Amino acid sequence: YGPDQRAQKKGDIILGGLFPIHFGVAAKDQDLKSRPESVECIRYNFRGFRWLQAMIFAIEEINSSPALLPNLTLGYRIFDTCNTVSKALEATLSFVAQNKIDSLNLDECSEHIPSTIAVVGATGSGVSTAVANLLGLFYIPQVSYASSSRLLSNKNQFKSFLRTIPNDEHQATAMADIIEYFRWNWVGTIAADDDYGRPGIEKFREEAEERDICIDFSELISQYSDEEEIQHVVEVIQNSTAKVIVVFSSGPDLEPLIKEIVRRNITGKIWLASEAWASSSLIAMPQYFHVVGGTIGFALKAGQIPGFREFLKKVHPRKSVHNGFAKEFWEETFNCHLQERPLCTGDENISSVETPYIDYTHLRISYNVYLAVYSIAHALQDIYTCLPGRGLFTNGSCADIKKVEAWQVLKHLRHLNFTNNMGEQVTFDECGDLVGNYSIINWHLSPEDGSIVFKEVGYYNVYAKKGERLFINEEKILWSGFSREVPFSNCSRDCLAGTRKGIIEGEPTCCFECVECPDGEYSDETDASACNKCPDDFWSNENHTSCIAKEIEFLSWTEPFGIALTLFAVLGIFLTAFVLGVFIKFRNTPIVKATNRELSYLLLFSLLCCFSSSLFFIGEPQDWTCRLRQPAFGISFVLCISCILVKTNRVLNLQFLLVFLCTFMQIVICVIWLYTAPPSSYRNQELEDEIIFITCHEGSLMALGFLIGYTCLLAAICFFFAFKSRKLPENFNEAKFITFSMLIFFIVWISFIPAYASTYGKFVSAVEVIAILAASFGLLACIFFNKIYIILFKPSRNTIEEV
Amino acid sequence: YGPDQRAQKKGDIILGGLFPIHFGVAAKDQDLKSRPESVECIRYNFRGFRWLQAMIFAIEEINSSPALLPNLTLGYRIFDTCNTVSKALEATLSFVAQNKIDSLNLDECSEHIPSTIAVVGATGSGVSTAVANLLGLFYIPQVSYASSSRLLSNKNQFKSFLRTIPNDEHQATAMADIIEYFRWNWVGTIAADDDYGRPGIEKFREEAEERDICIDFSELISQYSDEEEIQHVVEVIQNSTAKVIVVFSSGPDLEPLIKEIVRRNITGKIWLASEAWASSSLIAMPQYFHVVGGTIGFALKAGQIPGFREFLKKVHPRKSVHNGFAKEFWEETFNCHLQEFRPLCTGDENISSVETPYIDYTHLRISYNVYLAVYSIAHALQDIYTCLPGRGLFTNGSCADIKKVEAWQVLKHLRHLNFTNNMGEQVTFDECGDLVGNYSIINWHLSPEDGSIVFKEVGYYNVYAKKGERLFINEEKILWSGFSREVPFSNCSRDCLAGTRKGIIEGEPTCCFECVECPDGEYSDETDASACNKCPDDFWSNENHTSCIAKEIEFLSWTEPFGIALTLFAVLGIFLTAFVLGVFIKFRNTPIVKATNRELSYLLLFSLLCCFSSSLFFIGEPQDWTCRLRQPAFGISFVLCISCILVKTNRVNLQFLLVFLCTFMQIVICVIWLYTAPPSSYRNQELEDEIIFITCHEGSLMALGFLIGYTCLLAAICFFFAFKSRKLPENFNEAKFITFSMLIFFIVWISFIPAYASTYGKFVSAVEVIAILAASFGLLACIFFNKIYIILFKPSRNTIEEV
């Protein structure tokens, strides 16, 4: 009844089992020249035999214990799948022989042909899919220990499939979390071309696309990939700059690629291993460690089966009548031949040979096999202890254990809730899945043995909230097996401050160019997509990483030039005040009485007014400061000129009013300009990019020009009268002064436009304040220095009458 | 045995058949409260029954024709799959009952049914995978007509699977070609969660990422997706700006989402339908044309089966004894209930009256595939029949006995099959059991006459062409979204412009970008650009940053309002100096001119000539020869003038020797400065970025400073020697006039310091060409004015009048 090599025992209820005892089938090409024969299997699987023994041990433990299924013995019929759909399908056809016989009406034997109540499912997800398609026809519940494909959660197609292993959605999310944790964004993916690698790679692709992770390459491999595809994938890996490779595959499918990569000696790659090969003895070979060393993988939660190791050590080909795979196990363990290659004596010790069979540190899928067997057993017990009237069937009817059927066991397995030997609650959700934690391991080299050790470096809590599932202790991770520094696996290096991201055409967003910011903008953060513009009166620092205020530039009172000009003007005001004091003190003197005593007082008052008005130009330019800047000096200077002309007006109450009339025109022009186009406070920043120049535009230039021309007119009118008086030195020869006053005014303000009409910053104010001070000082000196010297420094020479 | 309803005919050779006569199973909630009864099917599939009739017609035509398998009749055993794995697996168990009895050795019915030797395959790719897993166990060939998944090309798993339909790799490549043809880069993808949609959308993902197409979303749908999943898919669809949605699905799995989208009235989307639902009656209903109208899809090559339509029209529930589905076909067509409230089927109705997809077709595409699969099996059988011994395909050149043929021999002959179909083309399966074929491209329109959706051919796909030339599309025949004739826009962002660049948006793919404007000095001219280009020197970016123009050259020259005035003033000065020379030359034999010196005055006049001429050296564009002597020219000339003028004072021919000695040191230092480090025409571009100044350097700046210092010291010495001589009225008090000349020169060459230091550019030569001639005028119009005016108009007031 099916394959010759089997492990079967009799009992009241028979449970089927499918384990990979070989890694695959012989690669003999069927040319169909002769009728095809059964294809042999090649490489023994000690781990798979351990899984089979876990199933057998669980069933024997159940039978020994009288508290679970009293007066009912459990049987089994376990076959070898060789990781192939064909072998497992032959075994499954053996399993459903009675169900198919009765459904197909082909009986038109009963004691023989035992009926399988439940099947402990396959390892591979494709194998489990193929088996479940046939098993769901008859509603035989199938509990898998290792198939973690999310495609088996579809209960519309797989009506009777449950599993004691978490499906791969959480594992793909966990790999995405691992990549996000180490700040990687340039990765490549490799997956097996089966129902396991493809959905997991797809889920990882979705998760990583969410987290702004860029996948450089994505290739598919298989156990039967020929030289061309393996070479192509090797070249794809070699060309890629991504160091982190995410692999969703098993051992047998990844073996050819790893062998080729070792042959071509590709090093420096970081491998993110799925659970199927993270603990695989096919790839964790020491000779491959220079390639696959430092692999970060996933491992399920380890379980505790108390008397399991003794059961494993007790296997013997002669004393294992029920287990048929024991003979081949002995032959492959001790490298001999059994007769019912040397001849095995049958007295060897399995502890003297190193194999995965007993040289294990954690039971992960073995505990899953145990849990699946115990789940079926507990469902059967729930059937047995059903109190009538409270059943799960129609009208609360309870099934009979003496005539139980597969669909009733399946119904009870859906509503199953029991506690395992580790105290945890074992329950299948609406999709038949069994959620569980993940462990995180790293591949190291054992210094004492030279083999590969799996060092736990973290875990993955599936019961935590999003973003709190992953914990990694990076201090325990040896990158590439030797290093202690986190590798760089970004497409491009980060852009520093003052630099932005530039697009590389035809490449993902993770690959960019660093472009310096323009001089008008800045960028402070690392890896910024744009340079923020410097706002308001700010400018960019020489490295465009900060904003620096645009310097406001002006003639300050505290500035050295401003200090000098203010002190010089104050000294002039003090000097004219002193001259006034001497004049009033010595008012009773014929020399002063000879000149216009009262009018000279108005002249010197206007002189002091001009000296003070010179201080208007220096300082902070406000609207009021430069509103009365030009016209204050205008009126003061025209008043001084009018006073000088009237004092010299010897050719003529009639003098003070004449001066008032002369200054009335100037005051009228000034007030007309003020009411029409008042000067404003310019804020000129568009002269130097980094400097703000605060000036004061005169509003309408025509009014200022007209005022200046008018002042020149009242200067030239006095100049003509002064010129003719050079031959008449009557009042102590004042012709040499009045001519000199107009001359120095004209010279100072004619020798100053090249200095004036050259600057438009702050020197345009200092130069013109210097011009005002110089003209006023010249006027003061010429008019009053000689007169005050004659009055004071010449007391004896104080002649009563002049010429 | 097996399914109750079936089509069955007895013969020497029996062919299995799997057709989806129903669209699915009844949505029954299996609570397992009662023993699970066989689930029933609900919706009828007239296309599936047409396919079944195609198989039956092919077998009947083969039997009638004596040129194919003479003296041998073909039987069939055809079952309904209802698009479900379970029903097809029941049918496959019926198919392999005999083989599996032989293998299981359960025979420990003599002829329950003649052994099935071939099975014309299923429709769904998952259903075909499930059936092929079981059929490959017994090496029973399976020729599918519709399963086009690339997973079935794996001959390591599917040993006996062949198909008359091409796999979907070419169709996904064709979707990528269509997307790139209309220049889209922002598309969404929807696939069916089965073995057809998933690998197809994965191949499309690979191809689209190869062509720089960005996929926005990627969702999976199913016939049994609940309301939550459909709702989430709908919000994902309408939360996106991608207008093109590429769908790899069938009619049943896409119906729920389409119905929901119609319910929520989402319009404007472009549908890229795969072959499975491009012609689906489930989706092509007129109610949905406002959503799925204007769909661009794929279709295979239609084939011509001559007498097929008559065979379809000849169906009858009472004359078709072999066909068991004919009764249900009649019931579903005429909406009645045949004898064993709906009316009673009299059996005299006309099938041509009712509009069902049965005979209402325009192109047999999968029906031709069914016909071709049957004929492929028949031709392999014929090849077995007409084999001459010694020229066979088996071990010793032998071949099988057709009277006892086995399924594996038929499979072997099908691998090496090469025959010509009725249409005259070669039918052969490659190493993967695949038939390569062309694709057609159709568009969903609306028929104004009937309202039904019509599939208008708008292109094709040529899989026998070189890569890149496979796609051909006639856009003028495409009605976009069913009404519009404008190609839709489905890019993530609008394209940039010329004077702008691309800006990275963080978290969005490379197809989504900003349009940051290029900064000043850099330009771009392409439609889109990832970086701003900068042209080389002598060029600056335009006002729109599109192109960059020549950096205009700024310097002092002629033919401008400033240069013309300066050269006019220079020629005026040379004119008055020539006039003065003529006055001194004509009236040379007079005592007046022979007051200071009769000949040294001529040397001074020549020096003034040279000083005036040196002013034109500063007005030209600085060349090598220009300003290597421009400053030396004025230096030497003015030193000569001062050397003449201080000797011109009397009581100092030793005068010429003294003048030459004074000028010799200046000439020597000028020659030394010129030879050691000559000033060079330096190209200046640092003051203003948009324009370039052509200035010239000075070489040894300290040499120039020393030259001007020597000149000013000599002038100061001349002024000092005339400082204490204004009393004597020698030669009409020339001491006062030389004092005036020296003072004028000093004010002109001391008042330009702020102009020189502040302003840099073209107005550095202008301030020189206005000061040089001003100082020269002061020297000329003061020293010689007192003599030219004396002897110009007056009766020369002389003969030692004041000498």
Ligand SMILES: *[C@@H]1O[C@H](CO)[C@@H](O[C@@H]2O[C@H](CO)[C@@H](O)[C@H](O)[C@H]2NC(C)=O)[C@H](O)[C@H]1NC(C)=O
């Ligand atoms: C590689 O790129 C990632 C981005 O994908 C960088 O991660 C960023 O790191 C900075 C500071 O370390 C964080 O402020 C960002 O939030 C991170 N971005 C993301 C998306 O998480 C990582 O730093 C880069 N590594 C190197 C070496 O440059």
Ligand SMILES: *[C@@H]1O[C@H](CO)[C@@H](O[C@@H]2O[C@H](CO)[C@@H](O)[C@H](O)[C@H]2NC(C)=O)[C@H](O)[C@H]1NC(C)=O
């Ligand atoms: C799954 O992993 C989580 C996280 O490691 C485990 O939660 C821990 O449980 C132990 C014992 O109950 C506590 O002492 C710790 O404080 C928990 N850590 C947490 C909550 O972060 C959990 O026990 C594991 N197993 C299950 C079945 O949840």
Ligand SMILES: *[C@@H]1O[C@H](CO)[C@@H](O[C@@H]2O[C@H](CO)[C@@H](O)[C@H](O)[C@H]2NC(C)=O)[C@H](O)[C@H]1NC(C)=O
């Ligand atoms: C597939 O499509 C191509 C192109 O549409 C077909 O090639 C045409 O073949 C006919 C005759 O067979 C020629 O008259 C045309 O000029 C061809 N068109 C081309 C090359 O563009 C081809 O016949 C179709 N079928 C197959 C099986 O290849």
Ligand SMILES: *[C@@H]1O[C@H](CO)[C@@H](O[C@@H]2O[C@H](CO)[C@@H](O)[C@H](O)[C@H]2NC(C)=O)[C@H](O)[C@H]1NC(C)=O
């Ligand atoms: C959508 O984007 C694509 C590419 O992102 C644009 O296609 C480009 O079109 C221009 C001119 O038609 C060609 O020169 C390029 O070679 C095309 N690029 C590619 C990758 O094919 C398309 O024009 C855009 N459509 C818009 C903006 O409406």
Ligand SMILES: C[C@@H](NCCCc1cccc(C(F)(F)F)c1)c1cccc2ccccc12
């Ligand atoms: C202080 C000045 N306001 C603008 C200066 C224009 C200027 C700058 C440089 C040179 C010259 C000048 F040569 F034309 F004088 C004018 C001012 C205000 C009011 C009356 C004035 C009368 C005479 C002179 C200046 C006057």
Ligand SMILES: C[C@@H](NCCCc1cccc(C(F)(F)F)c1)c1cccc2ccccc12
């Ligand atoms: C033409 C003139 N070259 C100006 C040099 C810099 C400068 C620019 C503006 C002002 C001054 C100065 F006031 F300091 F002189 C110097 C020059 C050439 C050779 C000899 C000269 C002797 C006297 C004056 C000018 C002389």
Ligand SMILES: N[C@@H](Cc1c[nH]c2ccccc12)C(=O)O
């Ligand atoms: N999960 C894998 C099977 C698997 C899990 N762990 C393993 C360890 C070894 C071998 C296979 C496995 C699958 O679905 O195919």
Ligand SMILES: N[C@@H](Cc1c[nH]c2ccccc12)C(=O)O
């Ligand atoms: N190609 C589809 C089957 C298919 C083709 N055309 C169809 C039309 C209707 C229904 C199904 C189909 C698959 O792989 O499964």
Ligand SMILES: *[C@@H]1O[C@H](CO)[C@@H](O)[C@H](O)[C@H]1NC(C)=O
């Ligand atoms: C990888 O690199 C090799 C050698 O540089 C080159 O021939 C090949 O085209 C590249 N790409 C792939 C996919 O192999």
Ligand SMILES: *[C@@H]1O[C@H](CO)[C@@H](O)[C@H](O)[C@H]1NC(C)=O
């Ligand atoms: C392979 O590469 C490693 C570098 O890690 C080097 O140590 C070793 O010698 C190489 N071996 C061969 C056979 O190239």
Ligand SMILES: *[C@@H]1O[C@H](CO)[C@@H](O)[C@H](O)[C@H]1NC(C)=O
């Ligand atoms: C869709 O967008 C709305 C608002 O525009 C938001 O509330 C909702 O969460 C989004 N859903 C999805 C699936 O994007």
Ligand SMILES: *[C@@H]1O[C@H](CO)[C@@H](O)[C@H](O)[C@H]1NC(C)=O
């Ligand atoms: C659906 O939308 C179309 C156009 O977008 C409109 O003509 C029609 O009336 C709408 N129907 C309903 C029921 O909203």
Ligand SMILES: *[C@@H]1O[C@H](CO)[C@@H](O)[C@H](O)[C@H]1NC(C)=O
């Ligand atoms: C099939 O046979 C024809 C001859 O009729 C030949 O031209 C063609 O090459 C053959 N095809 C193959 C794949 O051998």
Ligand SMILES: [Ca+2]
């Ligand atoms: Ca028990």
Ligand SMILES: [Ca+2]
């Ligand atoms: Ca690319």
Ligand SMILES: [Ca+2]
């Ligand atoms: Ca025939």
